[PDB]
Amino acid sequence: VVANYENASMAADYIKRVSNVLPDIGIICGSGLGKLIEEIEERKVIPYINIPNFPKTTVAGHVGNLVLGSVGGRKIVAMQGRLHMYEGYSNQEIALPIRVMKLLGVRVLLITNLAGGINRKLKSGDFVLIKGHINFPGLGLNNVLVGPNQDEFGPRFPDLSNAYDRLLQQLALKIAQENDFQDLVHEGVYAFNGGPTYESPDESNMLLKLGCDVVGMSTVPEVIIACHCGIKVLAVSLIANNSILDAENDVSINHEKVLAVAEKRADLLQMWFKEIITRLP
Amino acid sequence: VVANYENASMAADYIKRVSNVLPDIGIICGSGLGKLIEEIEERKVIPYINIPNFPKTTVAGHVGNLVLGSVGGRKIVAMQGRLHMYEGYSNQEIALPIRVMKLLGVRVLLITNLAGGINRKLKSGDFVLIKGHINFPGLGLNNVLVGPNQDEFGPRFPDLSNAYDRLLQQLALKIAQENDFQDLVHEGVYAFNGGPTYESPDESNMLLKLGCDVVGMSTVPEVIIACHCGIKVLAVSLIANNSILDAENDVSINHEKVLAVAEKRADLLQMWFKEIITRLP
Amino acid sequence: VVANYENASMAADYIKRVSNVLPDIGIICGSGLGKLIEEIEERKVIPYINIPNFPKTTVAGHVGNLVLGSVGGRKIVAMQGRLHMYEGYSNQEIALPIRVMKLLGVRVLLITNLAGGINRKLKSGDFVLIKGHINFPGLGLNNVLVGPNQDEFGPRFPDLSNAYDRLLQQLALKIAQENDFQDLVHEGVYAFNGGPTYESPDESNMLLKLGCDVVGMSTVPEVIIACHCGIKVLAVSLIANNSILDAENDVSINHEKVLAVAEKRADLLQMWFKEIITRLP
Ligand SMILES: Oc1nc2ccccc2s1
């Protein structure tokens, strides 16, 4: 199924008829960082399998729901179960839910992810406000926009220089300062590793040379589809490790260690994003 | 349809029966740089849709013609409507028209494109003679030659060190000097960005570190197919901007600005390539 | 055909019924480096075309056999005819033979390849023990593990930091010292060029900047599938040239020159790997 105007419209019509919520904020939460979704008020849960033209996610399994409701007095839609390109989903499958958000009325998209640290100032448990990216799949002919352009949504050749809204980064930092955890908050450039293997020790050393501050396997495809259709983005990485130190010391990362860092910072991140939603202009 | 000997032969036979031109020069023109094709003499226009085994281009739309005729006393074939890999065309679709050129008798292929400037000496409106390239799709398993080798055309493992003919670069510079616009003419290394998004500000900074002088979304696939089958190449970039300055100043590029630079330099480039064709050995 | 547990099990059952060998060592030999396979003792040759679920290799042609038998008193299985991703084989086709090795009992995989030299200390005829890699296809969304995870074989997110066993590198060096050819033996980082074009002169210069010591078109896909399912790896490159010198001098490489270096070093490499097999713990 192509992520075109007709197919996205049929999905949006179903959601409007089931939900009665017109959201203007969308959220996509990283591994182990979804507790906020469980606290949406006056909420409606819509399994992906029931939405016309949504991608099939049964081979992967696990949760796959759209959740609509209220947070801090604002109307929102959340993806509960994020789609990743290392699972084998196509460009069209990644893009369709973001384009449905657009048709539903979403103007701001808030994103979190788990990432490895490259910059020497970063350690386990830190947060990085993403200010730009290096898209290795895009340079190498696997950009999420390869294919015919869907002109109803945006232009053939997008400019990404303002993909990460500056005012939203400033608001996120302001709230950290107001609650005295600003010493955890950095800014940086995100390298997109297609995955699913963690970057090797020698790949980590290369990324340091290239000006990358963090590395992850998500986020950039959704950012590009959002920017193409005029949705503002805030993206925040939770740092699980420092991959440069691990390479120097012959120490390794694994998914169990990553999830343990997520559980340590989950409550703080939930509170932070609730206040961001509340305070959005 | 595979870009094999039998399929290319059926296309070449049709063209010979309609055209009565046996060209030894081929040309592929960049965005907004095709006025020379409109001035081919004693010309025959053959829409792609009518040529056996040519790729289907109706989803994209717009012009798609082969044009054969005479320029400066030489017999030529031009692609009017260039195929780009960011549109979703396969390796086989990109390669078949170049292999048809080979079977028709083409020995030299002349190419122009629009590109972003990386080297600090480059500004809007400059020309770059391409002397080498960095093929990010090729390193990343999206080379135009991935698949079975078509042995009738060339070897399994090509050497690209002479892909950009040195004598043709010298002739192009000589003509610029003869007509006193050599101050516009540089040489440089071309980075292939698969596209369709313009390189991000942080990608631009990375490309500077890696020794790239310009960045574009075309040209390298056709160069590789030509080199594989023994066709000499001259490739010239028209610089639309300097992406490093734009990143430092938080300024952006877009397709409207690119086309405006093309219109400013179109007449000069048309005259330059007419004389190159005339003077080819 | 997917490289899943059921499909690999049907292949392994056929091999066990034809062969009566339960190997614990697997070998994959590089271009022109397969003489050791011709000397396996008490051997059984099984053409790929006869093995359930093995990939079809007739479009490429040439030899394609599994060979089981004894070397130095050890039970081994060899791939005679290696699959390369530049030929167009999918992730699943590359992975299935390695996963069959796992089910047959293989615990150690020995690999050779032909490669270009990047490090200035490397010259034609040298050997490089591979200690790490830079996987350009993997960073760019063409990792061999893209797709659903086959949980029976390994984890969704593998760690590659110990992919190249340290003790096996030390044993290989010890044997070189015992037979006085240690002056040929280096260690280094392997860059995976998807291919099939040799790295261009400007790509070679980029690879030097990024910390690469050698460049090749094979090996990394098999290493990743082996590491995912717990098989130890030793990988050795035979250096055909120095690509940085060739770029500075405007000199070229080709497949004929590569095979001539392989023939010069074939006998020594055969003896080295026979002793490694004999001495494995
Ligand atoms: O490509 C990625 N490297 C890392 C390291 C830590 C955590 C998450 C990710 S995702």
Ligand SMILES: Oc1nc2ccccc2s1
């Ligand atoms: O990848 C590309 N960057 C640029 C900038 C300007 C113009 C054209 C192109 S194509």
Ligand SMILES: Oc1nc2ccccc2s1
């Ligand atoms: O990507 C590759 N470059 C080279 C050079 C020499 C030999 C073999 C290979 S494979």
